[PDB]
From a paper:
We have expressed and purified the IPNV RNA-dependent RNA polymerase [name] and determined its structure to 2.2 Å resolution. To characterize binding of catalytic metals at the active site of the enzyme, crystals of ΔC55 [name] were soaked in reservoir solution supplemented with 50 mM MgCl2 and 10 µM GTP and lacking citrate (which chelated metals, frustrating soaking experiments). A single Mg2+ ion was observed bound at the active site, coordinated by four solvent molecules and the side chain oxygen atoms of N389 and D402 in an octahedral geometry. The coordination geometry of the bound K+ ion does not change upon addition of Mg2+, suggesting that Mg2+ does not replace K+ in this position. As in the structure of IBDV [name] soaked with Mg2+ and GTP, no significant structural rearrangements were observed between the structures of apo and Mg-bound ΔC55 [name] and no electron density for a bound GTP molecule was observed. However, when soaked with an excess of Mg2+ ions we observe only one Mg2+ ion at the active site, coordinated by the side chains of N389 and D402. We performed additional experiments, soaking ΔC55 IPNV [name] crystals with up to 200 mM Mg2+ and 40 mM Mn2+, but these failed to reveal any additional bound Mg2+ (data not shown). In the structure of reovirus [name] solved in the absence of substrate nucleotides a single Mn2+ ion is observed in the active site in a position corresponding to that we observe for the single Mg2+ of IPNV [name], being coordinated by the side chains of D735, D585 and E780 (equivalent to [name] residues N389, D402 and half-way between D559 and S400, respectively). Upon formation of an initiation complex two Mn2+ ions bind the reovirus [name] active site. It is therefore likely that in the presence of template and nucleotide substrates a second metal ion will bind at the active site of IPNV [name] and the resulting initiation complex will contain two metal ions coordinated by D388, D402 and the nucleotide triphosphate moiety at the tip of the catalytic motif C β hairpin.
Members of the family Birnaviridae possess bi-segmented double-stranded RNA (dsRNA) genomes and form virions with non-enveloped single-shelled icosahedral capsids. From sequence analysis it was proposed that the RdRPs of Birnaviridae possess a non-canonical active site where the polymerase sequence motifs are re-ordered C-A-B, motif C containing ADN in place of the conserved GDD catalytic residues. An additional unusual feature of birnavirus RdRPs is their ability to self-guanylylate: auto-catalyzing the covalent addition of a GMP moiety to a serine residue of the polymerase in a template-independent manner to form VP1pG. We have cloned, expressed and solved the structure of the [name] [name] from IPNV in both its apo form and bound to a catalytic metal (magnesium).
Author numbering: 11 to 19, 31 to 792
The structure:
Amino acid sequence: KASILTALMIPKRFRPAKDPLDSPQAAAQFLKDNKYRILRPRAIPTMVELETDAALPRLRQMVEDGKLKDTVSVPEGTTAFYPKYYPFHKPDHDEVGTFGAPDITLLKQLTFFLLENDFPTGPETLRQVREAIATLQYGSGSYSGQLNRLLAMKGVATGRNPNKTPKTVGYTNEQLAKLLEQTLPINTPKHEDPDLRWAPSWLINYTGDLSTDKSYLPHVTIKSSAGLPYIGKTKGDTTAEALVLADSFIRDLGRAATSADPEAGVKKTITDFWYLSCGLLFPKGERYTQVDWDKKTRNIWSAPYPTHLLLSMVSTPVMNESKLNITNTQTPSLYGFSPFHGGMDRIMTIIRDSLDNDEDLVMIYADNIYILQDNTWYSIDLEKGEANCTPQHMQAMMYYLLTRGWTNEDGSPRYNPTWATFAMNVAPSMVVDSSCLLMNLQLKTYGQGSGNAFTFLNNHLMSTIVVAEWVKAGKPNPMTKEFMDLEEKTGINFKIERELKNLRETIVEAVETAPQDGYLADGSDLPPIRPGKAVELDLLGWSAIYSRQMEMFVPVLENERLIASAAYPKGLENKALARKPGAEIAYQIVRYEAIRLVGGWNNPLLETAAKHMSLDKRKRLEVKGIDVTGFLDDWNNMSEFGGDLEGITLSEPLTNQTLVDINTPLDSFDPKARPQTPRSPKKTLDEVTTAITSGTYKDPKSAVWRLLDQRTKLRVSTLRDQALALKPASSSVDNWAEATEELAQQQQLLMKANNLLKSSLTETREALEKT
Ligand SMILES: [Cl-]
Ligand SMILES: [K+]
Ligand SMILES: [Mg+2]
């Protein structure tokens, strides 16, 4: 019985608090009170329509065939205005909806299945999912979170442990290159890949013939933001515009560098294209802690499309040929590592051999360092990695790419003076210690902009410096003051995230506790009643579990990430796909299959509930006669785990065979059969560090490489003379090597004049900030 009034008419949803910093005045005052640098704002000319065939003559046929729009919009208007960027912060105080909704259906299913099954780890799984729903929130944070994050970046760059250039730490570019030959081994781009000699639009071959139509340019994310000067547009809406701007920037830089006044011309070009150095401060979608919603929102520094394209032309042809890591090469690098197809078992073999031989082991992946020492596994992270970067760290990376990558077999460069100018003299100041845009505020960026094309490379170089210093200090244990003292020595902040003690014993336990029943145990299509012990390496988010069926370690997503993803799944996030009938149900099948694939299969309660949910949805589709095989075959794009499992289809339900297939190696592994690094093959990181400590490799031997190192020290007014010094090697003229040797000797002599010594990175920053 209820009242007529009533008759007439699980954790609660998180509602973010009202944000007092959601206005430019309140945000600017907050930054000023915290001594965070706000730049004097710069303006961008309004858009003007130009004919595509006049602006992009190489693409005339594409316009004629109606495959490319006949006009391009370029910032050449008579009036200039200050740009404004307003991100979407969801959920927020006024809107708590489907976006960022926890998976309450899964929570209810986990509860129903726990009541029917005696899984000993079931109560803890349910408690963890419930706790993640109650304490976390998937979404894009707030203005307060973004602003507090900027303060933390400034603190890392300038606070307790101010940043240090590699030169201040004590490394020349050549010494860093010698370390990188070991920690980031690279191959040269393919011989058929064009050298760095052209405007980007010249790398597009279009005639209409599908057999020959090709682009030699990097690939792009069509749906990603165009960045400045096209706020609110995607890369798909602005490709022709990005080509026009990237061609103009490189052309104007090249012409200015060899002009009668290189300083005036180069500074003018940099100031005219200032917006190419300013990133949109995009709030990253993550599973944030509810209590810290307004204290921390991670940011993506959204690079202008022309800058992204020019930087990617330098890095991508090298990196595409350099998937060299500890599982296939004798290097500490984890670049291109996948734990699938036997990857995790290769890591476990290396770890086990190190333990048996009483050897220390180090692995590097961008801002992640893994150390095995004293029967202990250490997972180390640079503290807010990107904030530690100086423009000189990126310049050292450019030096490494141009000397080890962009070089012909005879030692001649695979670039001309224009591209050496962009790469060495200008590019590092465009994305490091430059600026970002939030609302109408042009803010200083402390360190490198997170998300720029060189994010991984610059972070990897900073970790390389920390590791080289650890080797130099006699490998002090990560838990000691001697290890923590490397922060001040390098100017790079870091912290120990995990300490996995009694490693040898933990590995023995993982093998011995491997279940006899279920998936990868006796090979049935059921989770084990009692999962075995995981080796919680947190190796790029992965733990290792022993399989009795396959007699190898296989990866499982770290428990905490698995639980967070089960509690707050990412939505479809594609409005076009969402409007197609069956896309939502296909995405739900994908969500439950992918959570099982990455490690849910080994969690009996999670596996039971997720299997029921995907099977129930497949049965409904079968009864209804609705075919979603198309969406299920092309599942990767609709899953946060899509990049982890390429080449598999979800059209058939997950079975033990799926788990076997994703873990099957193409080849057997012998760690001793791994090739040595392409450069200095016989040398190890330890031998390189010893050589450096003794004062070796200060200067490269190659005259071409010496010109590139001198390029980092000479002021922009010397660019015309530097172009003349590089011209014989760049043109591969008869006797170029002797000519280069002579020109490098003459330039070294002229450098005795201190008035000619100024970093072009400082000159670039000054021109970018000019008002
Ligand atoms: Cl940031
Ligand atoms: K620092
Ligand atoms: Mg890490």
